[PDB]
Design a protein around this ligand. Structure first.
Ligand SMILES: CCCCCCCC/C=C/CCCCCCCC(=O)O[C@H](COC(=O)CCCCCCCCCCC)COP(=O)(O)OCCN
Ligand SMILES: CCCCCCCC/C=C/CCCCCCCC(=O)O[C@H](COC(=O)CCCCCCCCCCC)COP(=O)(O)OCCN
Ligand SMILES: CCCCCCCC/C=C/CCCCCCCC(=O)O[C@H](COC(=O)CCCCCCCCCCC)COP(=O)(O)OCCN
Ligand SMILES: CCCCCCCC/C=C/CCCCCCCC(=O)O[C@H](COC(=O)CCCCCCCCCCC)COP(=O)(O)OCCN
Ligand SMILES: CCCCCCCC/C=C/CCCCCCCC(=O)O[C@H](COC(=O)CCCCCCCCCCC)COP(=O)(O)OCCN
Ligand SMILES: [Mg+2]
Ligand SMILES: [Mg+2]
Ligand SMILES: [Mg+2]
Lengths: 315, 315, 315, 315, 315
């Protein structure tokens, strides 16, 4: 059900005064008042794709956290029913009030305020995302551990998500900039006085949009650079781990060779430890002779094992 | 062969009474009665893609479990020969009878009933799919086992399948909503009275379709979130298993070092266990001296092995 | 070279009698007799893509094993030079003779015979492919072996190939069905009598083609289901093998712990086996005391090793 | 720099005599003499894509090793400056001279010679590529070795490269065949006499091009079959290697069990080898009793280890 | 903010004298002076895609390191605010001054200078990239090490990046060459005198652009060849490492067999080392008999182990 969702709205009139505070307005009343279309509101209500639409009496903006309807006399900010106003929305409202209470027309000032708020939020989000990755990379320079690699991958996923979001916002602004008739139709005050700019006269809007398109492009480039650096660090860590595993295997082989070398001498001592006739008992040289022979044979076995271990891994 | 498949049909007249109960009607008789086309029925008979088609005297619906033909006076629900009516179909029939026996026209009420049944079935299927995954993830928080990972992957496949099905249904409704002439052609009662709405007057149908498009979109988003969480859990489990394997290898190396350390002292005891002249027999200090020397050499070998094991894996 | 390939041909006249038996006809003579075009024959001669083409005096069919030219009076089946007639071709010829010697026109009966032969061959090939996979899956339920997995993959490749072939045949029939003017141009007997059906009158051909399109679709669906089941079985087998490898590694570690535990007691016995003064000789309690001490120390070492092995793999 | 590259050229007049031998001609002189365009010569000079272009007074061919300009009276073969004539180019020149010195027009004979040379070179290259792979596969049937697998992969890369080259040549001929106005414009002798063939009269060119398109298609199919066979052999070899590794691991485990079984009996003998009171000295049955007990315990330990090894890997 | 960025500019007049040295000019002043459009300057200011644009009174070039505006009387080189002139830019300025102070028009000479500078920079960058890879590949011919493989991959990434950059530059020149009306519009001096070349008269520009397109294509081909060689070397190194690992495993197995072979003889010596009645004491043959028996049994165990090791890995 729920045919009418009773959206939450706030409005500002021509002089910048708060003509209406946070209230509940139906969709039908909003459509009747602003003369909109259901398709435009349905496009706005999607919270995945930003949109900047122009209509012969309105400008519709659905950016990251702003749902704004700008007319030549009124500005409306709306949201879903039951939602509470956040700090960025209050800051945007205060900035819009300050700019409107103070040459540029009304709609251009509103658009400037919206773009300034969006760029500030983008920069703050980028810094908040970027700082822990720098801290982790600083900590990883001393020792290499698998948990740190897992944390690095977890942070890299968030960096990629933010890069995608910033790229989407920049592409929306670029697609608005590429159109020519929309920039001509963005003049509302001259439209009220029956003046048409034409398709060859749009100077202020192009500069105003470019001045923030550049700011978005810088953030996108920086995010891409951070992603590349993270990937390189991960590759280096993996190579180091593989080398460590190979060294451990070689050490185990050397320990096995040593064990065999001791076992041979233990066997020889056991042979002369029997309860039989050795024929060299009660002689002074027997003990030293057998000890030297056993030690020499153990050393020879160890040397042969080490030599063949060196010869095998020569390739 | 089988030129005529003799489809099973049920019909409801204008007053909502059951004018005909479950029966067998040929394809040719159905085409002659309803004035359809073979291509539309062939498109409907496919059980892989949902379809909402409009014709100048009919509305054709092939959703998840409904094959419905809506006219301005009659409603027909049909299925393949030999099939038995299920509980959702009986519930839909009862709901349609209750809504029609009771302002909105006939076809809009039928469409509302169909959409309500489809959304209810989608929500029930989503809950039934979602519950075992939550139970498995709750059980996996204590211990990690490979069989639980296999069960998690098996359930994730079903979640992905349901997400694809819900996405297909939502895309069908969205594609119907985007068209403009179809919404104008959806008025049948006014068409009987020779009244044409035009391409600029369609208000009721747009709201009615949006009110269920939103409900489908919510389910699609929730399924995507569940899939992402499952993937993250699988990655964490794999990392834990790799760390466990490395720890086991290190323990094996330490055991080898201990074995060598004991073997050296065993060799020394075997050297002094021979049946020869030791020159220190019948002396009080010999036993303690040899015992201390063997223990000291074993400890030295163990310490050197542990030190080199620590030094190797420093990188 | 080889400008003229001298294709092998067989022909049947209007009354169904064999007017000509297996013979050698040049390409130029065939083109002059049937009034064809080089492009159509070049399209037919490709043995990778099936084709159903319609021309104002002919129907051209290049299916799996049939190269058929159907006219309003004659039917020709042709093949490459030097080829021998197989059993399916002879069966198709006998069936066509029986159907033509016996309301439906000539070309529709020929098309029915061709489609029946193709569907029968498809079903026979599917059964022959499907049976060994079922046998292998039945044998694999008792024990898991790598050779059986290799055989399963080898059979799965053939199942995928047959699925692709059946999908290609079904897509050809569907693409023929979607066209509208071709179905109007498929009437040759009425074309001889200067009667044109038009673009709104084609009933018999649509039903006739749908009745075999459904039969192809069923086989495609069954092949896809078999492929999915094979993939699931392969995944289960791989998981079982990995678990077996981990269990073997754990058993090896336990054997190493046991070896160390015995080695410690062997060292202690070797210490008291020396030819020196033990100070407890000729006493009754010495043997039992040393035996108990060595056994106790071996058990303590084994218990400590097992406890640390349990503690390491807790994660 | 190098505005004019001074291409190397050879020419043949209408009677087939060598009117000019290998010489250096500028690009501007060639363009002025033949009335060409810079774009066509730039397309020809690329050595990666074959091209068959038709112009109202010329035919331009850039195949594998031929850069040929055919007119109704002259034939020119050109190449880069400083290059030397190879054996295939000399053979093509001799064949062209023999065919022209001898019904078919001039340009069709030149095209026939070019296509014959290209097909002969393709077949020779295919045989030269194919032979070593067959030799390696014959040698690999006795024993499996990693170096042979590396050689097989190295040869498979070359087979894939040749398959791609042959596919490119066949696609060029097919794209020339599909065009209709080009085949009409390929008649130059009739164009000199002011006779136009039209878009419905082209018989000789189609057969002439098809007779070599088939020859290219055969080679492409054979190369694809060889690639598939190589891939299957590689998969079989990898499976065999994995089975060998598993068998080696099992053998190592059995050796460890045997070592433990001997160690237990060595410990028991060491216990009775001490210099204490055994209480069974100077008795006849003691030696046999202890020997039998130690052997029995060693056999019991070995049997238990083998039984648990069998029980672990049952899954 | 920053509506006007105050770009850094340098200018050269018709006679080639430096009419203005490095200065700061606003975007609005540049647009008013040169009669440009905001879209063209926005396209130029992107530093990722090279561009060669033609306008009825200007030529706009944004290559690797040059931002050049060429008119029929003036040449301007510009860059961002705060940047310092580099050595390639100074060399390009000196070369342009030397060429202009000295038949070809003004704009063609400027374009020749720009293309010469770009090709020289491309060749220098290619040589600087190529040399360390050759040095590393020369050093790797003696011994194989993982660090050298890591360095090889690191250098291969840079080679791929340079190949992509050169491919982008070559594609820009090719796309400029393919256009026909742009080459006609590239004549500015004739445009001042009201002479139009037409779409069929452009000879000088085509040759001038081709003479550098070839130079770019050569560098792209050489970079691709280097990348392929690097990949082949990496594959060979990986195969060698795998063979080394297998050889190490076989050596470990042989060491285990030797350890067991010695352990058996040690057990037999321990059996005859006990303090019981051997019944062969005070006999001459006992010592030699037991020594020979123990050595023979150890050799038999070693031989059996080696034989079964050979038999296992036969497949
Ligand atoms: C007659 C001349 C013939 C040629 C001379 C011999 C040339 C090669 C040998 C030197 C023998 C010294 C011991 C080196 C054995 C190497 C294997 C081994 O296990 O030794 C150590 C650890 O064990 C250890 O730290 C010591 C383990 C016990 C050593 C084996 C028994 C030594 C013989 C009996 C000594 C009482 C393994 O680590 P590495 O330091 O890398 O060994 C290689 C360099 N020592
Ligand atoms: C003269 C001063 C020289 C420096 C002092 C030595 C410094 C380093 C050594 C301490 C020796 C104590 C035993 C530690 C050996 C480590 C290898 C080992 O196998 O021990 C244990 C298990 O075996 C065990 O639990 C015990 C196995 C038997 C121990 C080897 C023989 C000990 C010598 C003979 C004792 C009668 C392996 O697990 P971990 O607890 O992690 O070992 C490291 C910490 N102990
Ligand atoms: C004083 C109280 C201290 C705490 C009590 C000890 C608590 C823990 C120990 C029980 C010791 C019994 C032997 C278990 C050793 C485990 C390692 C081992 O190699 O034993 C077997 C195979 O070897 C075998 O089947 C036997 C190998 C030889 C056993 C080692 C020497 C035993 C001591 C000398 C006995 C004459 C390994 O397989 P598992 O059955 O899984 O072993 C774990 C359960 N037994
Ligand atoms: C009282 C009745 C209790 C049940 C009877 C025992 C049933 C199971 C045992 C038979 C024992 C014979 C030796 C088989 C041990 C298996 C492990 C082993 O290392 O033996 C061989 C190689 O070593 C070898 O070739 C020989 C290595 C030395 C053998 C271990 C010591 C034998 C005891 C002392 C003999 C003087 C391993 O390879 P396999 O042939 O596959 O072993 C399994 C079949 N023999
Ligand atoms: C009665 C006739 C029966 C048939 C004759 C026997 C046929 C097969 C055997 C020859 C035995 C000689 C020793 C070869 C054992 C092979 C395993 C081994 O560990 O030896 C070496 C290293 O250890 C070594 O370098 C030596 C390790 C100690 C050798 C084991 C004990 C030898 C017996 C006691 C000798 C006093 C392993 O490396 P490889 O050279 O590749 O061994 C294979 C070729 N020797
Ligand atoms: Mg050991
Ligand atoms: Mg011992
Ligand atoms: Mg003794």
């Amino acid at each position: 059900a729920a045919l009418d969702p009773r959206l939450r709205c706030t409005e500002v009139d021509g002089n910048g005064n708060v003509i209406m505070v946070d209230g509940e307005l139906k969709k039908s009343e909003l459509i009747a008042k602003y003369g909109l279309l259901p398709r435009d509101l349905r496009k706005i209500d999607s919270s995945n794709l930003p949109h900047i639409l122009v209509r012969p009496s309105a400008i519709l903006i659905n950016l990251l956290h702003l749902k704004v309807l700008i007319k030549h006399d009124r500005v409306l900010l709306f949201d879903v029913y039951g939602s509470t106003s956040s700090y960025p929305q209050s800051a945007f409202m205060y900035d819009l009030q300050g700019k409107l209470q103070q040459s540029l027309p009304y709609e251009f000032r509103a658009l400037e305020a919206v773009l300034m708020s969006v760029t500030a939020e983008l920069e703050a989000d980028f810094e908040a995302v970027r700082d822990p990755v720098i801290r982790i990379l600083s900590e990883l320079e001393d020792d290499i551990d698998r948990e740190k690699l897992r944390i690095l991958l977890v942070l890299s996923k968030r960096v990629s998500t933010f890069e995608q979001k910033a790229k989407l916002v920049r592409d929306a602004i670029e697609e608005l900039l590429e159109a020519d008739d929309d920039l001509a139709a963005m003049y509302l005050t001259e439209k009220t006085h029956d003046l048409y700019r034409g398709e060859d006269d749009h100077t202020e809007v192009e500069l105003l949009l470019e001045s923030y398109h550049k700011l978005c492009d810088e953030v996108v480039q920086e995010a891409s650079n951070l992603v590349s650096s993270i990937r390189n660090t991960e590759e280096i860590i993996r190579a180091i781990l593989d080398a460590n595993r190979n060294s451990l295997m070689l050490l185990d082989l050397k320990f096995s060779i040593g064990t065999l070398g001791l076992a041979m001498g233990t066997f020889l001592a056991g042979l002369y430890g029997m309860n039989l006739e050795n024929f060299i008992e009660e002689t002074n040289w027997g003990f030293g002779a057998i000890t030297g022979l056993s030690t020499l044979l153990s050393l020879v076995v160890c040397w042969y094992g080490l030599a063949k271990l060196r010869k095998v891994q020569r390739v």
